[PDB]
Amino acid sequence: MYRTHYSSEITEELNGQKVKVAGWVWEVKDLGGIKFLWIRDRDGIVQITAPKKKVDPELFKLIPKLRSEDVVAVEGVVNFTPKAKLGFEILPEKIVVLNRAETPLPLDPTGKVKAELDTRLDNRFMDLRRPEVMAIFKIRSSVFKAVRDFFHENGFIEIHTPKIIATATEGGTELFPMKYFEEDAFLAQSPQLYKQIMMASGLDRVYEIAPIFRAEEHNTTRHLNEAWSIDSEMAFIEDEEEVMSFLERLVAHAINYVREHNAKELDILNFELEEPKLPFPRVSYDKALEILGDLGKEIPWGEDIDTEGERLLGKYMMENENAPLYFLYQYPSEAKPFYIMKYDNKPEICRAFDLEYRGVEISSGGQREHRHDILVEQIKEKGLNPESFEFYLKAFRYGMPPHGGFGLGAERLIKQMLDLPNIREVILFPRDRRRLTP
Amino acid sequence: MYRTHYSSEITEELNGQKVKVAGWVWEVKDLGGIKFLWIRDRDGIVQITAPKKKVDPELFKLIPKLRSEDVVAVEGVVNFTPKAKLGFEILPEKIVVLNRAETPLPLDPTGKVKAELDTRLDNRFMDLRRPEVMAIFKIRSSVFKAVRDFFHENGFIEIHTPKIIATATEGGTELFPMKYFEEDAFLAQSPQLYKQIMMASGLDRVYEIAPIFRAEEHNTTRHLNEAWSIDSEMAFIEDEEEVMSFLERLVAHAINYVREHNAKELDILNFELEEPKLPFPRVSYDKALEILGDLGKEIPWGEDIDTEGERLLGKYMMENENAPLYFLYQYPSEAKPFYIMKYDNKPEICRAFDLEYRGVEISSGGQREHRHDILVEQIKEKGLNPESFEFYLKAFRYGMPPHGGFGLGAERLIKQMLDLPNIREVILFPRDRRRLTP
Ligand SMILES: Nc1ncnc2c1ncn2[C@@H]1O[C@H](COP(=O)(O)OC(=O)[C@@H](N)CC(=O)O)[C@@H](O)[C@H]1O
Ligand SMILES: Nc1ncnc2c1ncn2[C@@H]1O[C@H](COP(=O)(O)OP(=O)(O)OP(=O)(O)O)[C@@H](O)[C@H]1O
Ligand SMILES: [Mg+2]
Ligand SMILES: [Mg+2]
Ligand SMILES: [Mg+2]
Numbered sequence: 035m036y037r038t039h040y041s042s043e044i045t046e047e048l049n050g051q052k053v054k055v056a057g058w059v060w061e062v063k064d065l066g067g068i069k070f071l072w073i074r075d076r077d078g079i080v081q082i083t084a085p086k087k088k089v090d091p092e093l094f095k096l097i098p099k100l101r102s103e104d105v106v107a108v109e110g111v112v113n114f115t116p117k118a119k120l121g122f123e124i125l126p127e128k129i130v131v132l133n134r135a136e137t138p139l140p141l142d143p144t145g146k147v148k149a150e151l152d153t154r155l156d157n158r159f160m161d162l163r164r165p166e167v168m169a170i171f172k173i174r175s176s177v178f179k180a181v182r183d184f185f186h187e188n189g190f191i192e193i194h195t196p197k198i199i200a201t202a203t204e205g206g207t208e209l210f211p212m213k214y215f216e217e218d219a220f221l222a223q224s225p226q227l228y229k230q231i232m233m234a235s236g237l238d239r240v241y242e243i244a245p246i247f248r249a250e251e252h253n254t255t256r257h258l259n260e261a262w263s264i265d266s267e268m269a270f271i272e273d274e275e276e277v278m279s280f281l282e283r284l285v286a287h288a289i290n291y292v293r294e295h296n297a298k299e300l301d302i303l304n305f306e307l308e309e310p311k312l313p314f315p316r317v318s319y320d321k322a323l324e325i326l327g328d329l330g331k332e333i334p335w336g337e338d339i340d341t342e343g344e345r346l347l348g349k350y351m352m353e354n355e356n357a358p359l360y361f362l363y364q365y366p367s368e369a370k371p372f373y374i375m376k377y378d379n380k381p382e383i384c385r386a387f388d389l390e391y392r393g394v395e396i397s398s399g400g401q402r403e404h405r406h407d408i409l410v411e412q413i414k415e416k417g418l419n420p421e422s423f424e425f426y427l428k429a430f431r432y433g434m435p436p437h438g439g440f441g442l443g444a445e446r447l448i449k450q451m452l453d454l455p456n457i458r459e460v461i462l463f464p465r466d467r468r469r470l471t472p
Numbered sequence: 473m474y475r476t477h478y479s480s481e482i483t484e485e486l487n488g489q490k491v492k493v494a495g496w497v498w499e500v501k502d503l504g505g506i507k508f509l510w511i512r513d514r515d516g517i518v519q520i521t522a523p524k525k526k527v528d529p530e531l532f533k534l535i536p537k538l539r540s541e542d543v544v545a546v547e548g549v550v551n552f553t554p555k556a557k558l559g560f561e562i563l564p565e566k567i568v569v570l571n572r573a574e575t576p577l578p579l580d581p582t583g584k585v586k587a588e589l590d591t592r593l594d595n596r597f598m599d600l601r602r603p604e605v606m607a608i609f610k611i612r613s614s615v616f617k618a619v620r621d622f623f624h625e626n627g628f629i630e631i632h633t634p635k636i637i638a639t640a641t642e643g644g645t646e647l648f649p650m651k652y653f654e655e656d657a658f659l660a661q662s663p664q665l666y667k668q669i670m671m672a673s674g675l676d677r678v679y680e681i682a683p684i685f686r687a688e689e690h691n692t693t694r695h696l697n698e699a700w701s702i703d704s705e706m707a708f709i710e711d712e713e714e715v716m717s718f719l720e721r722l723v724a725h726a727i728n729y730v731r732e733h734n735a736k737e738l739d740i741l742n743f744e745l746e747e748p749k750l751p752f753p754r755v756s757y758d759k760a761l762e763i764l765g766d767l768g769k770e771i772p773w774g775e776d777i778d779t780e781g782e783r784l785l786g787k788y789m790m791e792n793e794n795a796p797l798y799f800l801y802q803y804p805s806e807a808k809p810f811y812i813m814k815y816d817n818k819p820e821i822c823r824a825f826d827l828e829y830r831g832v833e834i835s836s837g838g839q840r841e842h843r844h845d846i847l848v849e850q851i852k853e854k855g856l857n858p859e860s861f862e863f864y865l866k867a868f869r870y871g872m873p874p875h876g877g878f879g880l881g882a883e884r885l886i887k888q889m890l891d892l893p894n895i896r897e898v899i900l901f902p903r904d905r906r907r908l909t910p
Contacts, residue, residue, distance in 0.1 A: 036708040036873075056708050058674065058871050076674045103871040107708070132708075133842065135871040159867045162673035171675070175630040182620065189478075192613040196901045197635075197683050198648075198659075198698055200908050210636075212650040212659070215687070217908050221636075221650075228901065231910075235600035236496065236514045237609070245635055245683065249653070262632055270474040270494050270545070270570075404571060425910045429597045433496050433541040433573040436474070463634045463666065470638050470652050472669065472863035 036107035036132065042077035044122060049114045055080050055124060056107035056132075058163065060143075064098040071097050071126075073106060074143075076168065082108055083123040093126055103135035103143065103163075151458060158462055158472065169299035170460060173292055174448050178243065180291035181264055181442075184284050190239040190266065195228035197221055197245065202422035204371050208248040210259075221247035224441055229267040230373065230402060231429040233437040241266040243444070253466045255456045256341075256394055258445060260465040267439030274375075274385040274401040277438040278316075278361055281389060281397060285359065285442070286310035289451060305452060308358060315351065315360040319369075319383070322362055325350055336366045348393020363387035372412040375403040375438075385438070391450035399440025406430040474545035474570065480515035482560060486550045493518050493562060494545035494570070496581075496601065497538045507535035509564075511544060512581075514606065520546055521561040531567055541573035541581065541601075589896060594910065596900055607737035608898055611730055612886055616681065618729035619702055619880075622722050628677040628704065633666035635683060639860050641665050642809070646686045648697075659685035662879055664811065665864045667705035668840060671875040672867040679704040681882070691905040693894045694832055696883060698903040705840075705877035712813075712823040712839040715876040716754070716799055719827060719835060723797065723880070724748035727889060743890060746796060753789060753798040757821070760800055763788055774804045786831020801825035810850040813841040813876075823876070829888035837878025844868040 037056035044053060057075035071082035084097055100106065110126040117123075140157040141149050145164055154161040161167050185192070198212070200219045210221040225242050232240055246263040271277060289310050293300070300307055317325075323333055326343050329350070333339055339347070339362065351357045367376045367384040374386045386400030403409045409430060413420045420427065448460040458464040463472050475494035482491065495513035509520040524532055538544065548564035555561075578595040579587050583602055592599040599605050623630070640647050642661035650657050663680050670678050684701045704722075709715060727748050730738070738745050755763075761771055764781055767788070771781060777800070789795045805814045805822040812824045824838035841847045847868060851858045858865065886898040896902040901910060 035710065035714060056873070074674065076676055105871045105873045132874065133872050136869045139870055140866070156863075157866070159669050159672035160870060162670075162675065168674065171631070172629060174632075178630050179620070179624060182617070186617060191610060192616050193609070193900060194612075194683075194700055196698060196903060198685065198903055198908070201910070210650065210652075212648060214648075214908050215905065219908060231597050232600075232900070234597035236512070236606065237600060238514055245632075247636070260634060260636055272473065276473060428578070428595075431574045432577055432598065433543045434571050435494070435543045436570060462631065462670070465634060465636055465652075467653065470636070470655050470657060472666075 036130070037075075040077045041073075041075050041080040041120075044080070044112055046114055048112045049122070051112055052109065052127070053112055053124065054107060054109045055082075057105070058135075059100050059102055059104045059106060061102075062097060062100050069094065069097045071100060071106075071108075071129075073108065074163065078165070079120070081118055081120065081123040082110065082126050082129075083113070083118075084126060088125060090127070093129055096129055100131070101135060101137065103139060104131055105133040105135075106131050151456065155458060155464060155469070156472065165302050169296075169302045170448070170452065170454075171462070172299050173296050173452065174444075174460060176292050176296050177288050177448055177451070178444065180288040181284060182241075182243065183291075184287045185241045185266070188239070188280070190241045190268075191237055193229070193232060193237065193240045193242050194244065195222070195225040195242060197247070201227060201425065202419075204416065204418065208250055210247050210249050223248050224263065225265050226373070226441070227423075227426045229265055229439060230437065231426060233267055233269045233404075234429040234432065234434045238269040238435075240268075251467070253468075254341075255458075256446070256449075258457055258461060258464055258466060261446075261461070262444035264442040264444055264447075265439065266442075267437055269435040269437040271401060271436055271438050274363070274387060274399075274438055277399055277401065277440060278363070278387055278389075281399065281440050281442070282312060282314050282359070282361075285389070285391075285396075285447070286312060288447065292451065303452065307451065310359065311357075314389075315355050315357050317347070317351070317360055317362055318364045319362060319366065320364070322347055336368050338365075338369045344390060344395060345393045348390060351390075352392075359389065359391050361387050361389055370400065372416045372418065373402050373409065374400045376412075389440075389442075391447070392453055394446065394450050396446040396450055397440050397442040399438065401436070401438035404430060404434050404436050406434070474568070475513075478515045479513050479518045482518075482550055484552060487552045487560075489550055490547065490565075491550055491562070492545060492547045493520075495543070496573075497540055497542040497544060500535060500538055502536040507532060509535050509538065509546075509567075511546065512601070516603070517558065519556050519558060519561040520548065520564050520567075521551075521556070522564055527564060528566075531564060534567055534569075538569070539573060539575075541577060543570040543573075544568065545570055589894065593896060593902060593907070596910075603740045607734075607740045608886070608890065608892075609900070610737050611734050611890065612882075612898060614730055614734050615726050615882065615886055615889070618726040619722060620679075620681070622725040623679045623704070626677070626718070628679045628706075629675055631667070631670060631675070631678045631680050632682065633660075633663040633670075633680060635660040635685070637665075639665070639864075642686075643854075646688050648685050648687045661686050662701060663703050664809075664879070665861070667703055667877060668811065668875065669864055669867040671705055671707045671840075671842070672870065672872045676707045676873075677704075678706075684879075688905065694884070694887070696895055696899065696902055696904055699884075699899070700882035702880040702882055702885075703877065704880075705875055707873040707875040709839060709874055709876050712801070712825060712837075712876055715837055715839065715878060716801070716825055716827075717751070719837065719878050719880070720748075720750055720752045720797070720799075723827070723829075723834075723885070724750055726885070730889065741890060745889065748797070749795070752827070753793050753795050755785070755789070755798055755800055756802040757800060757804065758802065760785055774806055776807055782828065782833065783831045786828060789828075790830075797827065797829050799825050799827055808838070810847070810854045810856065811840050812838045814850075827878075827880075829885065830891060832884065832888050834884040834888055835878050835880040837876065839874065839876035842868060842872045842874050844872070
């Protein structure tokens with residue numbers, strides 16, 4: 035390997051030892067009798083210091099020839115010194131140019147000249163050379179790990195369900211159709227039917243983290259046509275609050291991992307990520323509509339709360355409860371899918387919920403209707419043909435436990451966690467109405 | 473929740489304490505003075521013992537009404553006794569019937585009546601109720617976790633890249649075209665182009681575990697049209713051996729994790745999983761052809777090693793070097809993709825390798841050609857159009873370090889690890905030339 039240590043891995047114990055560092059030329063300063071070369075790697079910059087009397091002359095004359103973003107590797111001696119910005123410098127013995135950069139760069143890695151989002155996405159490899167962008171994707175990786183670790187510690191088994199499918203769906207919208215040899219198929223929008231089917235398997239506690247595909251017809255700052263969904267389903271529950279409790283602890287775990295493990299990245303983003311305060315507040319749909327009504331926002335009882343309503347409620351919950359995260363629940367049954375269980379005692383409302391983070395939905399879930407005949411009737415109530423869901427209904431006939439679950443958008447989670455304005459900031463290569471490349 | 477403990481979670485410590493167990497009805501003995509009920513959960517069977525003298529008369533009467541595969545929950549007292557074949561029994565206080573099963577069942581969960589693979593695939597929720605099937609999918613989840621943990625321990629950051637793309641990632645054959653609104657697009661055969669682009673970002677060490685899609689024309693025991701690929705790319709390498717070293721370590725780690733954490737599943741499968749022996753043998757393509765020729769299997773230099781050749785080599789390596797896992801490397805450049813670096817001093821061969829597990833390819837990879845102009849010429853040598861790869865080529869112009877990586881098939885790995893005859897055994901809902909549903 036051309037390096038032994040990243041910038042962040044050199045500590046005082048290495049003082050006076052030889053190391054190899056490598057990265058991209060950040061800055062060269064030829065100051066006469068001394069020259070400086072700064073190299074950027076994933077973790078930051080490292081100072082290479084070349085005093086004329088202390089380095090090989092060919093090294094001395096090479097440094098000024100180095101150009102911005104050239105890829106280089108340096109072998110030299112670690113010298114901890116107060117004179118060094120970051121505590122230590124490397125006195126070079128060997129400098130190798132691995133690969134030379136072309137010279138109008140697509141983006142300015144110093145951030146001085148700022149670029150449009152479009153230009154940045156078109157040139158993502160350059161965009162990540164900026165610490166604030168790298169910080170987001172380090173945090174994305176952290177969130178994924180924290181989520182999986184939490185599932186594992188709680189006895190969940192990872193599953194993988196198909197993305198090329200030919201099943202019916204409730205909405206029949208936003209589908210990406212595709213030919214599958216002789217047959218017609220579509221890309222999956224959610225593993226919903228599959229994870230429910232597996233509740234009849236004994237697996238009991240499953241999760242899947244995998245792409246979902248929805249052909250949204252218009253762009254928003256909150257939607258992508260390709261996204262990563264964190265899906266779970268869990269059996270033998272008594273009510274939807276057990277799913278909500280799990281979900282909030284999961285999200286709090288992800289938040290706390292980022293706070294503990296990515297403080298450097300948070301600092302780079304000039305961002306203070308709040309300590310989660312559990313039980314998040316629960317706000318019934320009835321109460322949410324009342325709050326919205328008093329704000330002059332109309333939503334007729336029975337209809338889903340729209341994007342404006344979420345925004346207003348998010349603001350209200352922050353102002354009144356200092357709560358960045360809260361649940362909407364006890365929705366009208368008519369506003370939620372046929373697979374959600376109704377309150378047997380008050381069937382006009384159902385056991386579904388949405389988790390809101392800074393005024394944007396990050397997850398929806400609920401307890402499902404596991405009783406076959408009631409489920410069938412609910413499909414009918416939606417004006418749909420139960421026969422079209424046969425392959426799924428079949429799993430409810432041979433011993434199906436009560437169950438519930440959620441779908442948690444990874445991009446939504448990260449965008450909202452970091453209070454970023456656009457979801458395109460938290461996925462490397464966005465797909466939207468007009469973006470298909472890179 | 474309806475349960476507090478799985479069957480596997482009840483130990484001596486809990487003797488005399490109250491627990492809740494739940495699962496599917498496995499057997500009932502309806503006797504005059506006593507009922508015995510056995511329930512099955514994800515981990516095994518639990519005995520419920522109900523002497524008439526000891527239990528609620530309503531509970532005594534209920535047990536004989538239960539039927540195979542009914543879902544039930546039982547609260548009761550743990551009682552360790554030599555008289556229970558599993559070491560303990562539950563003395564029940566309350567039994568709740570959660571859901572009743574229909575007859576006949578789609579498959580026989582007792583294992584007595586054998587079913588064909590197609591029938592089993594059509595009814596996976598039933599199929600997993602058998603311990604030998606559950607065992608595979610528990611092992612699948614363990615393998616994913618082990619792989620991720622190893623990547624993390626070794627400083628790799630998880631990435632996520634598009635599965636809807638404008639340019640085929642692995643070439644013209646075995647490709648799913650798909651319309652993306654007005655545009656022509658395809659499903660990703662691999663994340664190859666993206667993981668390379670990210671080598672110009674500073675991320676340096678990335679992995680992605682995600683679906684890949686290949687429209688295979690033929691139906692075989694070792695191909696699917698949808699699969700999970702474990703991809704990695706790593707920068708600042710000096711040669712492809714560094715990548716092979718990392719891969720064998722990764723695979724060894726996965727195998728040892730299954731050995732350590734899934735012994736019970738290996739037992740159920742009546743399977744001895746061998747302790748990995750690093751380093752695996754490295755066999756050059758030239759030497760492989762010598763070995764085969766010595767065996768009377770003649771492959772003209774430059775041609776692919778066919779499945780027969782793989783089988784013969786696997787057996788030889790198992791016999792000669794006691795190695796279930798070995799690498800083939802230094803392949804003919806003509807037989808490998810444009811993105812592989814040729815040996816500069818011997819251009820007919822290239823820095824590509826395959827990892828073979830019990831005579832079947834489970835991974836391929838290599839050092840990439842990171843030098844822009846040479847890369848372009850290689851795209852041309854393959855008869856392709858460099859302009860179709862502009863977003864990818866752009867990344868090689870502004871400081872690109874040397875790099876290399878691999879794609880490791882999750883299904884291939886698990887199938888070969890457990891010496892299973894058919895790749896459909898290791899993914900819940902396989903997609904092949906003839907299978908699109910469920
Ligand atoms: N049809 C299939 N069914 C089941 N599994 C499959 C199928 N096709 C591939 N795989 C698996 O993914 C690995 C890499 O794919 P390759 O085409 O060899 O290389 C590539 O795709 C490169 N980009 C990898 C690299 O150079 O990094 C295989 O070894 C295998 O287990
Ligand atoms: N087009 C998308 N882009 C990114 N994430 C999405 C998208 N569609 C759904 N998700 C997300 O997956 C989750 C569960 O899926 P769900 O069907 O409930 O979404 P949704 O109700 O349609 O979301 P929304 O109202 O914002 O369009 C969401 O709560 C969210 O985080
Ligand atoms: Mg939507
Ligand atoms: Mg919504
Ligand atoms: Mg929703």
